[PDB]
Amino acid sequence: DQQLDCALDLMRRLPPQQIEKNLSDLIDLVPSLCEDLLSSVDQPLKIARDKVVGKDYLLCDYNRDGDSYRSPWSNKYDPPLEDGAMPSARLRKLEVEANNAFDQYRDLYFEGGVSSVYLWDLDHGFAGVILIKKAGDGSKKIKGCWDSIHVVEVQEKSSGRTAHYKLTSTVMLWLQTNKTGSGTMNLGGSLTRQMEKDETVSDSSPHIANIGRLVEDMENKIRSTLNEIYFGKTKDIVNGLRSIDAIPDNQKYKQLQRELSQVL
């Protein structure tokens, strides 16, 4: 478990542009860590096609079993599977609802893209994953992509009427161009955040409603920090590496003030 910490530390340093190929290698390098890495390292979401209902679905570790994936639409594995991990018929019903709910959510904030929601049974409650993938248009000169991975944990209290929610959300944001002006330019990666809240479970405010509000808040708050880090911070860093206008004797000199100061 000090091994895993290293792998994850490495994954936060190797270029996110090669997340998929790097994870492949990292596992080969330390095969015991596989199961763990696969569940704790986020990868750009892939789209598969449920041929039965004719609709796309998203793929992560939480709907994988073996080398097969469970479509939230037909509730079946592809390629077909002997005995795959399924949700209890009680939960499946909530899953199918959560998918419809987050489908609208998707439309409301993304005006397109794909969403998929997978629920699974825990001990004193349940857990869910909410996935959203939206791609920018090939009409404009810049390729863009947005992957959302929201993992929620629900711990129901013995009463009902109140429950505790743990949310871990990752957004992966990918931007890229071959505009001859700047050669190639790839700005990519992700941010992760945590919310933890207790809330009323009524009929007017059920689980999906509670999870939804949490997701919405986090996604709005991330969308913000993303914009600020991607187009604010990383750019400022660039501008702090080189200056177009010839450096003014003021900063040149303020810099000597501080350079000299750092004497062991």
Binding site: C6, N227, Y230, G240
Partner: protein, 270 residues
């Protein structure tokens, strides 16, 4: 269930790809994971050196100001690198970034004079445009042709703030009077990692031709070409950042739905 010869290849790949100013951290990660200091020292010795030459690592030499860049153009075999400004040789430890053994060295006076006039004018340019910049200018023969190689490095390391950044320029001037062939590569890399992993990788190839004269007069013109090319590159970067921000990002996820208000979840559920 994968060969030990392969495992080290992966480990080597990982090390070469360490973000700027995070070599140690990546190395420690890779070491602990491979779990075989014997494989590391053999099949990865090549990687440590390659990374430093690849990254244009600046290094201080004792009693000298200022620093010199570790490139493939200063590589002399052994484990020794050339400082063309001071005309000295020195030993380098690729693992601990240590420059030992200052040793007077003899330069092929074939280009010496052209090199000095560049190294001189580029020093002034670097000083003017790169807050924490270092540069090293080489003069050596490639395929019987006199080449001048100007290398620029600039970095800002702030591990405490979970971000690092580096600029690398490599300008090659093959000099065949009365003309010179310009060929360059400009690289940027930025890593942000507070509660995530976000990176900018960008490079630009530059290719050009110019008419030459006296060494001093065309050293000055070389620098102007460099200045112009790099400004255009940094501008293009900033312009693309703009477009990315207020066009393609806005087009990915809205800030609020078209109803200008947060989602009514009751409506969603019935």
């Amino acid at each position: 269930r994968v060969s030990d010869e392969e495992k080290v290849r992966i480990a080597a790949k990982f090390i070469t790809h360490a973000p700027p100013g995070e070599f140690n951290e990546v190395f420690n990660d890779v070491r602990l994971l491979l779990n075989n200091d014997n494989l590391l020292r053999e099949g990865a010795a090549h990687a440590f050196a390659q990374y430093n030459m690849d990254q244009f690592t600046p290094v201080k030499i004792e009693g000298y100001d200022d620093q010199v860049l570790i490139t493939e153009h200063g590589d002399l075999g052994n484990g020794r690198f050339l400082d063309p400004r001071n005309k000295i040789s020195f030993k380098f430890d690729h693992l601990r970034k240590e420059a030992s053994d200052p040793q007077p060295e003899d330069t092929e006076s074939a280009l010496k004079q052209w090199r000095d006039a560049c190294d001189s004018a580029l020093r002034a340019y670097v000083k003017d445009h790169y807050p924490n910049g270092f540069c090293t200018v080489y003069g050596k023969s490639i395929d019987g042709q006199q080449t001048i190689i100007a290398c620029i490095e600039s970095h800002q390391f702030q591990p405490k703030n979970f971000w690092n950044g580096r600029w690398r320029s490599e300008w090659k001037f093959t000099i065949t009077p009365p003309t010179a062939q310009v060929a360059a590569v400009l690289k940027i890399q930025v890593h942000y990692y507070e509660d995530g992993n976000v990176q900018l990788v960008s490079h630009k190839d530059i290719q050009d031709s110019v008419q030459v004269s006296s060494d001093v007069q065309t050293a000055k013109e070389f620098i102007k070409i460099i200045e112009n090319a790099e400004n255009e590159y940094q501008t293009a970067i900033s312009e693309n950042y703009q477009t990315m921000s207020d066009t393609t990002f806005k087009a990915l996820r809205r800030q609020l739905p078209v109803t200008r208000t947060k989602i009514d979840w009751n409506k969603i559920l019935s």
